Amino acid sequence: IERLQDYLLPEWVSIFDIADFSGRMLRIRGDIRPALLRLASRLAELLNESPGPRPWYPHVASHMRRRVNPPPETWLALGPEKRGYKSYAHSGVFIGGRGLSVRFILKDEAIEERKNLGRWMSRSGPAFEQWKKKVGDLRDFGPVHDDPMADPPKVEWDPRVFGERLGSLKSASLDIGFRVTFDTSLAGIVKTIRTFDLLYAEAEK
């Protein structure tokens, strides 16, 4: 049974205990990146075995923007475009000092897709709440973006107001999902990513 730890070694969480930029980046780029590329490819193959409402193409964080503060986490992204991913909805598998997580992301620069998903959330609060109940322990990673070891809070906001903000503010963003263990099967992770399909699809239009 293929598992996340076959790609991302459990001990790699300690890379994120390296406080200095150069030292942490060396390990993120040298050791974690090749593994994330392999894992991203494999997850995309598995997802594409049963097509969903949008394509999934693999990407890996480039870390070309950081200078002084090392990344608190690194990730692969699965999104609808072959090259680039930050301008569109995507799912990601992340590793940092806290371990692994699987999240659904709309960055501030995904202006149009935030407008689309925000409008859906605003108009479909009850459907969002139903979905949230079904997926269990949904966390908001937004508030802990500056607290790498902190347990992210449960999503408790009103999706209608959150959606209104997400759609209308240039600096708004979404980052929600699940903490997962290193021994989780790839088959289980694929299904977790599929549970974001409702949001992924509604972001497109």
| Interface residues toward Cl ion, by CB under 5 A | 84, 86-87, 184-185, 188
**Please, what's the b/e burial string for 162-199 (b: 16 or more CB within 10 A of its CB; e: otherwise)?**
bbbbbbeeeebbbbbbbbbebebebebbbebbebbebb
* Smallest gap from residue 111 Cβ to Cl ion (A): 11
Q: Which is nearer to Cl ion, 24 or 103 (CB)?
A: 103
Number of Cβ within a 10 Å radius of residue 101: 20
Find the shortest distance in angstroms from Cβ 188 to Cl ion. Answer: 3
CB of 59 to Cl ion, least distance (A): 9
Nearer to Cl ion, 87 or 173 (CB): 87
Q: Of 15 and 77, which CB lies nearer to Cl ion in the complex structure?
A: 77
Q: What angle do CA 192, 93, 89 make, to 5 degrees?
A: 80
Q: Give the sign of the dihedral formed by CA 108, CA 101, CA 162, CA 131.
A: positive
**Min CB(189)–Cl ion separation in Å:** 8
Residue number, 59 or 98, with CB nearest to Cl ion: 59
Within 10 A of 23 (CB to CB), how many other CB atoms are there?
12
State how far Cα 198 lies from the chain centre.
15
